[PDB]
Amino acid sequence: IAVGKDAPDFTLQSMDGKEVKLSDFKGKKVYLKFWASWCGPCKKSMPELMELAAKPDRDFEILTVIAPGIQGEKTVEQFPQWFQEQGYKDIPVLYDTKATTFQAYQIRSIPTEYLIDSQGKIGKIQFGAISNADAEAAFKEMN
Numbered sequence: 001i002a003v004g005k006d007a008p009d010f011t012l013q014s015m016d017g018k019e020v021k022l023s024d025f026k027g028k029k030v031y032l033k034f035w036a037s038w039c040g041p042c043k044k045s046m047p048e049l050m051e052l053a054a055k056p057d058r059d060f061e062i063l064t065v066i067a068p069g070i071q072g073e074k075t076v077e078q079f080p081q082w083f084q085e086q087g088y089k090d091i092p093v094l095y096d097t098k099a100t101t102f103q104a105y106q107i108r109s110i111p112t113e114y115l116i117d118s119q120g121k122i123g124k125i126q127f128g129a130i131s132n133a134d135a136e137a138a139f140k141e142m143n
């Protein structure tokens with residue numbers, strides 16, 4: 001994994017039971033956030049991400065990834081209940097049930113965001129939360 005190189009492919013079930021592939025988003029920039037329900041700064045960054053999702057006419061898609069049941073994350077049954085109770089919605093959550101997407105993207109800390117360009121290359125990486133302003137600006141400087 002490296003800035004400027006292809007973002008690793010993945011095929012994951014969403015919280016809502018749909019299969020989602022990075023390749024589904026060819027030609028769209030992607031905001032890809034790895035997080036966990038047990039992580040304070042991850043929770044704290046979610047309402048701001050809902051703000052971003054609510055903005056019309058974005059040339060990027062938002063996708064987030066958790067590893068359900070892994071290293072303390074909530075079970076697949078418990079997670080959606082918790083998510084809804086926080087008031088969270090309109091944010092895709094993909095289930096990395098094998099931890100292989102976290103592994104593929106070499107996650108060391110959370111939250112981590114990969115901002116992937118329209119050509120499927122990693123454009124930016126941010127350790128910790130990124131402001132919506134900074135994310136929007138970043139996507140403007142990417143292909």
Ligand SMILES: C[N+](C)(C)CCOP(=O)([O-])OCCCc1ccccc1
Pocket residue numbers: 038067070071072073099102
């Ligand atoms: C606070 N509790 C102990 C759950 C969270 C920290 O757990 P920990 O054992 O101290 O750190 C490893 C988690 C890193 C990770 C993330 C996602 C998938 C695979 C590995």
